[PDB]
Scaffold this active site. Structure first.
Site, PDB file in Angstrom:
ATOM      1  N   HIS A  79      20.584  25.283  -9.976  1.00 27.39           N
ATOM      2  CA  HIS A  79      21.436  25.160  -8.851  1.00 27.39           C
ATOM      3  C   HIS A  79      22.080  26.362  -8.359  1.00 27.39           C
ATOM      4  O   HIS A  79      22.987  26.336  -7.353  1.00 27.39           O
ATOM      5  CB  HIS A  79      22.387  23.955  -9.154  1.00 27.39           C
TER       6      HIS A  79
ATOM      7  N   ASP B 234      25.530  15.571  -6.994  1.00 27.12           N
ATOM      8  CA  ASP B 234      25.300  16.207  -8.464  1.00 27.12           C
ATOM      9  C   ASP B 234      25.930  15.308  -9.282  1.00 27.12           C
ATOM     10  O   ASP B 234      27.249  14.957  -9.103  1.00 27.12           O
ATOM     11  CB  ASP B 234      25.688  17.726  -8.197  1.00 27.12           C
TER      12      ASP B 234
ATOM     13  N   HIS C 153      27.353  17.242 -11.541  1.00 24.71           N
ATOM     14  CA  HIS C 153      28.219  18.501 -11.915  1.00 24.71           C
ATOM     15  C   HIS C 153      28.830  19.197 -10.496  1.00 24.71           C
ATOM     16  O   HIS C 153      28.147  19.027  -9.556  1.00 24.71           O
ATOM     17  CB  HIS C 153      27.550  19.481 -12.614  1.00 24.71           C
TER      18      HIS C 153
ATOM     19  N   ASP D 122      29.854  22.161 -10.375  1.00 25.47           N
ATOM     20  CA  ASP D 122      29.183  23.559 -10.311  1.00 25.47           C
ATOM     21  C   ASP D 122      30.213  24.524  -9.580  1.00 25.47           C
ATOM     22  O   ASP D 122      29.850  25.388  -8.549  1.00 25.47           O
ATOM     23  CB  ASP D 122      27.779  23.618  -9.575  1.00 25.47           C
TER      24      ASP D 122
ATOM     25  N   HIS E 286      24.391  28.552 -12.757  1.00 25.53           N
ATOM     26  CA  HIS E 286      24.209  27.386 -12.183  1.00 25.53           C
ATOM     27  C   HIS E 286      25.452  26.374 -12.105  1.00 25.53           C
ATOM     28  O   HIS E 286      25.263  25.391 -11.231  1.00 25.53           O
ATOM     29  CB  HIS E 286      22.715  26.912 -12.622  1.00 25.53           C
TER      30      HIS E 286
ATOM     31  N   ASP F  83      20.845  17.814  -6.516  1.00 28.00           N
ATOM     32  CA  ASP F  83      20.487  18.099  -7.963  1.00 28.00           C
ATOM     33  C   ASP F  83      19.906  16.818  -8.225  1.00 28.00           C
ATOM     34  O   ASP F  83      20.651  15.718  -8.210  1.00 28.00           O
ATOM     35  CB  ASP F  83      21.743  18.579  -8.589  1.00 28.00           C
TER      36      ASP F  83
ATOM     37  N   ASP G 208      19.466  15.715 -11.143  1.00 28.46           N
ATOM     38  CA  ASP G 208      20.615  15.450 -12.113  1.00 28.46           C
ATOM     39  C   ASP G 208      21.728  14.139 -11.537  1.00 28.46           C
ATOM     40  O   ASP G 208      22.218  13.812 -12.663  1.00 28.46           O
ATOM     41  CB  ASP G 208      20.850  16.377 -13.073  1.00 28.46           C
TER      42      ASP G 208
ATOM     43  N   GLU H 214      16.744  21.723  -9.920  1.00 30.02           N
ATOM     44  CA  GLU H 214      17.078  21.343 -11.275  1.00 30.02           C
ATOM     45  C   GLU H 214      15.715  20.604 -11.803  1.00 30.02           C
ATOM     46  O   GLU H 214      15.986  19.747 -12.928  1.00 30.02           O
ATOM     47  CB  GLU H 214      18.130  20.728 -11.631  1.00 30.02           C
TER      48      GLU H 214
HETATM   49  O1  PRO Z   1      29.316  25.287 -16.178  1.00 31.03           O
HETATM   50  C1  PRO Z   1      28.461  24.809 -16.807  1.00 31.03           C
HETATM   51  O2  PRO Z   1      27.522  25.379 -17.349  1.00 31.03           O
HETATM   52  C2  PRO Z   1      28.438  23.135 -16.939  1.00 31.03           C
HETATM   53  C3  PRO Z   1      26.989  22.860 -16.246  1.00 31.03           C
HETATM   54  C4  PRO Z   1      27.505  21.329 -15.831  1.00 31.03           C
HETATM   55  C5  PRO Z   1      29.243  21.341 -15.760  1.00 31.03           C
HETATM   56  N1  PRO Z   1      29.620  22.915 -16.272  1.00 31.03           N
HETATM   57 MN   LIG Z   2      23.953  21.641  -9.936  1.00 31.81          MN
HETATM   58 MN   LIG Z   3      23.841  18.943 -11.980  1.00 30.69          MN
END
Ligand code: PRO
Ligand SMILES: [Mn+2]
Ligand SMILES: [Mn+2]
Ligand code: PRO
Ligand code: PRO
Ligand SMILES: [Mn+2]
Ligand SMILES: [Mn+2]
Ligand SMILES: [Mn+2]
Ligand SMILES: [Mn+2]
Lengths: 312, 316, 318
Positions: A101, A124, A126, A128, A141, A232, A234, A277
Site C-alpha cells: 500500500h 482498508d 488499516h 496507513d 505501507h 486494500d 485486506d 496487498e
Molecule cells: O504501520 C504499520 O506497519 C501497521 C500496519 C497496519 C497498522 N499499522
Molecule cells: Mn493499506
Molecule cells: Mn491494509
C-alpha cells in the site's frame, strides 16, 4: 452496454513498503484471474501499460534504526507517479495493481497532478497514516497518507528519496471505510484532524448503505469531484481474502465489498483505483491464492459497472 | 485502567464430553495475559483451580456433587477476587461454572445484572432436563422466582438464589428446549434470539439490553459468555455447536458495548473444548476468538482508542 | 410432545427431475433431503403427513434440450400437486432441478387460481425458449407460467398442456445475483418486483419480507407458493448445487425468510430444488446442503430459533 469507460491498467510489483515477500506477484495473480477479459466484457476501452520495472536502489538500509527502505520506496513511487500522471493525462481511469500500500503515495500524487479537487475513498483494515515518527514497524505501507495530507506536513520529516512529494489532499477530502487495526497515534490523527472514517464498528451500526451515503455526502455532497478509490484487499475478512500480509479478522463480507464498488461506479466519478496487498505466496493453498485474486477482479469489475442484477 | 483477575476453572462434569477442562489453558496459550497487559490492565492470575474430587441423581443428573461442591469453592475465590478490587475473569470449563461465579459475585454485588450470551438459555430445572447435564441448568439454581420448581440436589444447598427474572437478559439464543421457552415466557425473562438480532441489528439489541438492565440505575454487570454463541464456523472447538450464530463482528460489538458501560465486574468465558476440534487451527482459532471477547470486554477497540494519545512527535 | 402452536397438513412429493439441466446428480436431491431426516423433523413439528413417495426427445430449435421429457414429467407432477392441494395439504416438492416449478405451480393454480409466488433464488429463471443461451429448461420455468409473457413464448413439444397462471404482479423474487441480460430486460419491462442481494444489503431481510408480503398479500389473503432454490444460499453454506454463485443468503437470512412465510399462515405449496449431492467435494458438504434444505422446509412449517413451536404445559414440581 449501459456505459463505456476508458481504463488504463498499471502493474506495480512492489514489496519494499513492508517485510513479507511475495506481494510483488500481486499484479500477475490478478491478471491470471482474468482482469482484462472481465473489463473487456463490460464495455471498457482498455490500455495496458504492463507491469512496471522499478529502478533498484543498491544501498538502502534502516533509516534511524526504524524506516525500512525509504530510498527504494521513494523512487519507485516517484516513477509510478509519472505513469499514473500520463494515464490520467491521456483521459483514462487509472487502475494500479499492487504491490503493497506504499504505492498509494505514487498513485495519488500522480493523479493529483491533474485533479486539483481530487477526493479519496480509502477501503482498508488499516488507516496507513502513521508518520515516520509515529510508526512502530517502520514499514512505509503503513505511512502513505501522512506524506499526502496537507495538515500533517509539519509532522513529517524529510526522508531520503521523498523530496519530490507534495502534500495534495486535505483532511476533509479523504474518507476511510473498513478500519479495524488502528495504532493509537493514527487514532489521534483521525480524531484530531477531523478525518471522517467508518470502522467495522460503524458499519455494524449503520450498515453499508448508510456508510456509502454518508461517504458521498461528505466528499461530493456540494460538488462533483474525481474519486480515487484506494482499495486494500485486506479490507475483506481473511476468510475471503487470505492471501495478504496483514490480515485482520472481522472484515468486510463479499456483499459489503461489492456494494462499496457498485456505489463508487454509480457516482460516475471514478477516476483512479488502487487494488493493493494481494500476496499469493502467503496463501496456504493454490485455491486460497486464486480466491483472493478472483475477489480482486470482482472489486475492480464492480467499480467499472459489473452488478448483481444483470444491468450491464 | 482495569484491575483484572483471571481464574482458570477447569469444569468438565457439567456435561459428558471430555476436553473442556483444558479450555482455560488453551485461552492462556492463545496469549490472553499479553493482550490484557497491552491494554494497561492491572493483572492477577490465580492460575487454574484444583477442585476437591468426589452417584447419579434420580437416574438422570450426572456428577452433581462434584459440580455443586466445585462451584462452592469457585464462588469463594470469586468473592475474594471481587473483594480485593479485581474484575473477575473466569475461564471455563463448562457453563455450570456460572453457578459459582454468579453466586460469588452476588455476595459483594447484590444488585448485579447478568448478560447471558449463548446459543442456549441454560435454564432447565433438574426436573426438566433431558440430558441431565448440569451445564444446561445453571440459571434455574440462580433465579429467585424459580426456587419452588428446583429441588435440593446433594451439594447445592449452599446456593441462595440471587438474581430476579428482570435482571438477566439473554443474547444469541437459537437452541431452546420447550420447558426453557415456557420458563422464558412465563417468568417474563427478556431475550434477544438470533431472530431478534436479524430484525433489530446488534446495535439496537445492545441499546435495549441496557435499557432493561441499567435503564433505572447503574449496576454491576456480570457477562456470562459461552463461546458457542458464535457460529460454529468461527468457534468450532465446543460441545454443543448450533448453526446460525453470532458473527465475529456482532460478538466484538457486544463486548465493546459492555466495556463502554464502565460497569463490567465479572466475566465468564465458557465452553472452549480444544479436543473437539478436528485440527490444531480450529482449536487455536476458537481460543483466539475467546481472547478477543475478553480483551474487548476490557477495552480493546476496532479503532485504536484504548490508550490516551496527547501529542504527535515533531521532526522539530 | 402432545402440544403444538400450530398443526399443518403437509404432503411430500419427490420429483427427481434432472433433464431441465445438464449436470448429473440432482435427481438424487429428494433422497438426500429424506436421508437428512425430513419426515421425522416434520413429525416433530406436529404435522399431519402424507408421503406421495418419489415419482419416476429431440432438441427444440437446436437449443432447448429434453422439452418433451420435461414438459410431460411436469404435466404428471402438476396432477399430483393439484390432488394434494385439493385434499387440503400444503404440498412440498423435493427436486430435482428448478424446471419442476412449471409443474408444481401449474398444478397448484388449478385449485388456487389466486395464488402468489415467492421465488427465492440466485437466478430469475425467466429466460424464454428464445432468449436462453444454455437451452436448459430450469433457466426458463417462469416464462411458461407468466400471463404477460405468453406471446413472447413459442409452443414447445411436451408443453401444449400449460396455461400461464400467474400475472407479473403475483411473483416476487428474493436473492437474485446472476441475472442474464434478457432476464434483466423482462424483469424491468414487465415490472416484476425483485429483491436482489443488493436490495437485501440495503434494506435488511426483515424489510425485504415486509415489502414482499405488502406486494403479494397486502390486499387480500392468498395461497402462497414458495419456490426455493438452495442456490439462493451462499455456496459456502450450500455447496452441493449445480449453479453456485458467490455472495448469497446467510443461514440466518434463509431461516428468516421461511419463518416469515410460516407466520403468514398462508403457505400452500413449497418447492425445494437444486440440491445435487454429487457436486459436493465431501460428505459434510453434501450433508450440510441437505440439512439446510431440511431446515428451510421445517422453518416453513413452524421450526424457529426461539423454540416456541412445541407447546409446554406446566413445569414439574419436586
Ligand atoms: O504501520 C504499520 O506497519 C501497521 C500496519 C497496519 C497498522 N499499522
Ligand atoms: Mn493499506
Ligand atoms: Mn491494509
Ligand atoms: O439441557 C441441556 O443439557 C441442553 C444444553 C443446551 C440446550 N439444552
Ligand atoms: O438460463 C440459464 O441456463 C442460466 C442458469 C442461471 C441463469 N440463467
Ligand atoms: Mn451455555
Ligand atoms: Mn451454549
Ligand atoms: Mn432456480
Ligand atoms: Mn438458482
Amino acid at each position: 452496454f449501459q456505459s463505456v469507460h476508458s481504463v488504463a491498467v498499471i502493474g506495480a510489483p512492489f514489496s519494499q513498503g513492508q517485510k513479507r515477500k511475495g506481494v510483488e506477484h500481486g499484479p500477475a495473480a490478478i491478471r491470471e484471474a482474468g482482469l482484462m477479459k472481465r473489463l473487456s466484457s463490460l464495455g471498457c476501452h482498455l490500455k495496458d501499460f504492463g507491469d512496471l520495472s522499478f529502478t533498484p536502489v543498491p544501498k538502502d538500509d534502516l533509516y534511524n534504526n526504524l524506516i525500512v527502505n525509504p530510498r527504494s520506496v521513494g523512487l519507485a513511487n516517484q516513477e509510478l507517479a509519472e505513469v499514473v500522471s500520463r494515464a490520467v493525462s491521456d483521459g483514462y481511469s487509472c487502475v494500479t495493481l499492487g504491490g503493497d500500500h506504499s504505492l498509494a503515495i505514487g498513485t495519488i500524487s500522480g493523479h493529483a497532478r491533474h485533479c486539483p479537487d481530487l477526493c479519496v475513498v480509502w477501503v482498508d483494515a488499516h488507516a496507513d497514516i502513521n508518520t515516520p515518527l509515529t510508526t512502530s514497524s517502520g514499514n512505509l505501507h503503513g505511512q502513505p497518507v501522512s506524506f499526502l495530507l496537507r495538515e500533517l506536513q509539519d509532522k513529517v520529516p524529510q526522508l531520503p528519496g521523498f523530496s519530490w512529494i507534495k502534500p495534495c489532499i486535505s483532511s476533509a477530502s479523504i474518507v476511510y471505510i473498513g478500519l479495524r487495526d488502528v495504532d493509537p497515534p493514527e487514532h489521534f490523527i483521525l480524531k484530531n484532524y477531523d478525518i471522517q472514517y467508518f470502522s467495522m464498528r460503524d458499519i455494524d451500526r449503520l450498515g453499508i448503505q448508510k456508510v456509502m451515503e454518508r461517504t458521498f455526502d461528505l466528499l461530493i455532497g456540494k460538488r462533483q469531484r474525481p474519486i480515487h478509490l484506494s482499495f486494500d484487499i485486506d479490507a475483506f475478512d481473511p476468510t475471503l481474502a487470505p492471501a495478504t500480509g496483514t490480515p485482520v479478522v472481522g472484515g468486510l463480507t463479499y456483499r459489503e465489498g461489492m456494494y462499496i464498488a457498485e456505489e463508487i461506479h454509480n457516482t460516475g466519478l471514478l477516476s483512479a483505483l488502487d487494488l493493493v496487498e494481494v500476496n499469493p505466496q502467503l496463501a496456504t493453498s493454490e485455491e486460497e491464492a486464486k480466491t483472493t485474486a478472483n475477489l480482486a477482479v470482482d472489486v475492480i469489475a464492480s467499480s467499472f459497472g459489473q452488478t448483481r442484477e444483470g444491468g450491464h
